């Protein structure tokens, strides 16, 4: 088991600003496997869902590799292993509106949490 | 090599009778950039409940976690003795009608990710 301590919440920011989407987690004793973190986006302005935007796996970050939000979504912490899977989305666009899901796995534990993002003109 | 991480026949239905063993295939192919650690997860969305995406088995850090997950505990296991060769398949033994649902095979070898869905039908 594994818990994401951030609550599901709605972040509202203005176009062109930076959105911080928190995702902080704690581990249970059996979570001894490799830390794996992913974020997915389900945008409001298209019917595509669960698209990967960022991944931490094998102690490497893959961010711009994923086309959605390329160049604009990055992990905020310099130590993800300390329990901080949060991300920043820079230069917010109206197309960024949607539901973002943080997925944290440290085998065998798994947890997920959704953050809703609204961008204001 | 494939152009991107790929699973053979990514959406299909498997049908078996109650009490039999179902073989749920998930055969994958890597692309040249998939250099991270292999990770494989299967999830169930049962037809008899509102729960979706419940983990039933995981291969991560070269370890298998199966009965650790309560759904189908004791009855779902990987079939291959060499998952790294491309065989992420699982079998479900002594099938029950409550096993009916959508099973998802998720294969990750960073940065590649691929998914497959199997609709499992159990016949009386």
UniProtKB/Swiss-Prot annotation, chain A:
Reported tissue expression: Expressed in pancreas, brain, heart, small intestine, testis, prostate and at a lower level in liver and lung. Isoform 5 is ubiquitously expressed. Isoform 3 is expressed in heart, lung and pancreas. In skeletal muscle, isoform 1 is found at the neuromuscular junction and isoform 2 is found in blood vessels. In cardiac muscle, isoform 1 and isoform 2 are found at intercalated disks. In heart expressed in subendothelial layers of the vessel wall but not in the luminal endothelial surface. Expression is elevated in hearts with dilated cardiomyopathy.
Top-level lineage group: Eukaryota
Domain Ig-like C2-type: 2-116
PTM info: N-glycosylated.
Disulfide bonds: 23-102
Residues modified by glycosylation: 88
Domain comment in the entry: The Ig-like C2-type 1 domain mediates homodimerization and interaction with JAML.
Task performed by this protein: Component of the epithelial apical junction complex that may function as a homophilic cell adhesion molecule and is essential for tight junction integrity. Also involved in transepithelial migration of leukocytes through adhesive interactions with JAML a transmembrane protein of the plasma membrane of leukocytes. The interaction between both receptors also mediates the activation of gamma-delta T-cells, a subpopulation of T-cells residing in epithelia and involved in tissue homeostasis and repair.
Subunit (UniProt): Monomer. May form homodimer. Interacts with LNX, MAGI1, DLG4, PRKCABP, TJP1 and CTNNB1. Interacts with MPDZ; recruits MPDZ to intercellular contact sites. Interacts with JAML (homodimeric form). Secreted isoform 3, isoform 4 and isoform 5 can interact with the extracellular domain of the receptor. (Microbial infection) Interacts with adenovirus subgroups A, C, D, E and F fiber proteins as well as coxsackievirus B1, B2, B3, B4, B5 and B6 capsid proteins.
Protein name per UniProt: Coxsackievirus and adenovirus receptor
């Amino acid at each position: 088991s594994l818990s994401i301590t951030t609550p599901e919440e709605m972040i509202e920011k203005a176009k062109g600003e930076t959105a911080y989407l928190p995702c902080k987690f704690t581990l249970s004793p059996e979570d001894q496997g490799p830390l794996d973190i992913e974020w997915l986006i389900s945008p409001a302005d298209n019917q595509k869902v669960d698209q990967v935007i960022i991944l931490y796996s094998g102690d490497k970050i893959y961010d711009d590799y994923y086309p959605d939000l390329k160049g604009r979504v990055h992990f905020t912490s310099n130590d993800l292993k300390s329990g901080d899977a949060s991300i920043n989305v820079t230069n917010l666009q109206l197309s960024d509106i949607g539901t973002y899901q943080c997925k944290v796995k440290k085998a065998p534990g798994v947890a997920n949490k959704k953050i809703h993002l609204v961008v204001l003109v």
